[PDB]
Design a protein around this motif. Structure first.
Motif, short mmCIF file in Angstrom:
data_model
loop_
_atom_site.label_atom_id
_atom_site.label_comp_id
_atom_site.label_asym_id
_atom_site.label_seq_id
_atom_site.Cartn_x
_atom_site.Cartn_y
_atom_site.Cartn_z
N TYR A 88 0.82 -1.21 0.00
CA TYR A 88 0.00 0.00 0.00
C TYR A 88 0.85 1.26 0.00
N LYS A 89 0.53 2.19 -0.90
CA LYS A 89 1.12 3.54 -0.86
C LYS A 89 0.50 4.41 0.24
N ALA A 90 1.34 4.97 1.10
CA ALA A 90 0.83 5.83 2.17
C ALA A 90 0.07 7.02 1.60
N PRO A 91 -1.03 7.40 2.24
CA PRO A 91 -1.74 8.61 1.81
C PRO A 91 -0.93 9.89 2.02
N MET A 92 -1.37 10.93 1.33
CA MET A 92 -0.83 12.27 1.53
C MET A 92 -1.95 13.28 1.40
N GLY A 93 -2.12 14.09 2.43
CA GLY A 93 -3.08 15.16 2.45
C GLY A 93 -2.35 16.46 2.15
N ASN A 148 -10.07 10.08 -3.32
CA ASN A 148 -9.38 8.95 -3.96
C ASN A 148 -7.88 9.26 -4.08
N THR A 149 -7.57 10.47 -4.50
CA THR A 149 -6.18 10.90 -4.64
C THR A 149 -5.44 10.94 -3.31
N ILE A 150 -6.03 11.58 -2.30
CA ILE A 150 -5.42 11.66 -0.98
C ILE A 150 -5.14 10.27 -0.39
N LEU A 151 -6.12 9.38 -0.48
CA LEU A 151 -6.02 8.08 0.18
C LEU A 151 -5.50 6.96 -0.74
N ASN A 152 -5.14 7.29 -1.98
CA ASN A 152 -4.60 6.31 -2.93
C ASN A 152 -5.55 5.10 -3.09
N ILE A 153 -6.85 5.38 -3.20
CA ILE A 153 -7.86 4.32 -3.21
C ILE A 153 -7.71 3.44 -4.45
N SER A 154 -7.59 4.06 -5.63
CA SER A 154 -7.39 3.31 -6.87
C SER A 154 -6.02 2.67 -6.92
N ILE A 155 -5.00 3.44 -6.55
CA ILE A 155 -3.62 2.97 -6.54
C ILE A 155 -3.45 1.73 -5.66
N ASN A 156 -4.08 1.75 -4.49
CA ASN A 156 -3.96 0.67 -3.52
C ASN A 156 -5.02 -0.42 -3.62
N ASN A 157 -5.99 -0.24 -4.51
CA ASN A 157 -7.14 -1.14 -4.61
C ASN A 157 -7.76 -1.40 -3.23
N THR A 158 -8.12 -0.31 -2.55
CA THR A 158 -8.78 -0.36 -1.23
C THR A 158 -10.12 0.34 -1.34
N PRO A 159 -11.09 -0.30 -2.01
CA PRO A 159 -12.35 0.40 -2.29
C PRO A 159 -13.25 0.65 -1.08
N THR A 160 -12.93 0.06 0.08
CA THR A 160 -13.77 0.23 1.26
C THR A 160 -13.47 1.54 1.97
N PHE A 161 -12.38 2.21 1.60
CA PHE A 161 -12.14 3.55 2.10
C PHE A 161 -12.99 4.56 1.31
#
Length: 329
Positions: A257-262, A316-329
């Motif tokens: 997982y790529k860490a998020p960035m705000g 999606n960008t902040i939390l890397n939802i697509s990048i990380n394939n974590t759709p529950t966020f």
């Protein structure tokens, strides 16, 4: 016309009662001043690396006017160009505790300076309180501090570090086998959110190790930092020369997982750290950390403190939802 503020070194600093122009030496503190003031309007100087980070983050959307702020008044070794600062005429400069000679020279030039500290989460809170006094925004400063304290109390009460059979977590900095060591805040964050540190016996904050060591650890979860362009598909498709990640549990189970960035990267202490803790908690011990919705808490934070309502795309960008394939966020 004058007020006196006590900084984090216990130094009493005189300055104008009304502060309208602030320059900021420490890199993460540009985003922190923004958070306390709920605005970039008083910022007149930032570190060039703060500008770099600004251009790459949601900060650019929140604070379009910072594009035109001075970032030349201080270099990468935190050396201040005193001629430039004197021209800029800030009402106060934020500097580091280890720069007393800078404080003294600035004072000789009629420019107040306040010293802050680095290393801990308490330093962030004390620095916020100080900014509240400087900016005359004590309510926003205390609301931010309360938010951090309430988050700390929540994680202490959950007490996930006490759980048995914790997932082994590696915090990978870059494409050159550098990982978070046992002096890093990242290992503290892993422990607080119920993980075992894969690099528990590696010293330092960021430390280079061998691929053989990592194979031996065999982490269950890998978090990739924002210090580097590395993304999960770089590991999954073995794009990295001299490294074979294919037999690592985290890789086989697709838990890279790529860490998020705000507003700033979440890899070290900052104003949004409680949101980072919430992200990690739900990756590492989702059954424990099951009584919040991260997306809602992120929206609430941006609305409350920045008066900005995030879209789904921005989240999606902040939390890397697509990048990380974590759709529950």
């Amino acid at each position: 016309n004058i007020k006196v503020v006590t900084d984090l070194t216990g130094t009493d600093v005189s300055m104008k009662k009304e502060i309208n122009r602030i320059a900021i030496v420490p890199i993460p503190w540009t985003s922190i001043v923004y958070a306390v003031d709920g605005s970039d309007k008083k910022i007149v100087g930032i570190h060039p690396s703060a500008k770099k980070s600004y251009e790459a983050s949601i900060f650019k959307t929140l604070a379009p006017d910072l594009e035109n702020v001075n970032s030349s008044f201080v270099d990468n070794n935190f050396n201040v160009n005193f001629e430039e600062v004197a021209k800029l005429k800030p009402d106060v400069v934020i500097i580091w505790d280890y720069q007393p000679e800078v404080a003294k020279k600035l004072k000789e030039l009629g420019i107040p300076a306040v010293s802050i500290k680095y290393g801990t989460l308490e330093d962030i809170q004390n620095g916020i309180r100080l900014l509240g006094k400087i900016l005359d925004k004590p309510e926003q400063a205390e609301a931010l501090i309360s938010y951090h304290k309430d988050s700390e109390a929540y994680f202490k009460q959950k007490n996930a570090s006490a759980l048995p059979n914790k997932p082994k977590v590696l915090y990978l900095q870059n494409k050159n086998l550098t990982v978070a060591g046992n002096n890093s805040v990242n290992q503290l964050m892993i422990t607080m959110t119920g993980g075992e540190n894969a690099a528990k016996d590696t010293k330092g904050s960021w430390t280079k190790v061998s691929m053989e060591e990592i194979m031996t650890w065999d982490p269950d979860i890998i978090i990739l930092s924002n210090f580097d362009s590395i993304r999960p598909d770089d590991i999954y498709q073995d794009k990295l020369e001299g490294q074979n990640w294919s037999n690592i549990k985290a890789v086989k189970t697709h838990r890279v997982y790529k860490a998020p960035m705000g507003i700033y990267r979440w890899d070290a202490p900052n104003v949004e750290t409680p949101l980072m803790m919430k992200w990690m908690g739900q990756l590492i011990q989702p059954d424990t950390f099951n009584d919040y919705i991260l997306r809602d808490d992120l929206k609430q934070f941006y609305n409350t403190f920045y008066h900005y309502n995030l879209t789904d795309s921005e989240i999606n960008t902040i939390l890397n939802i697509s990048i990380n394939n974590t759709p529950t966020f």
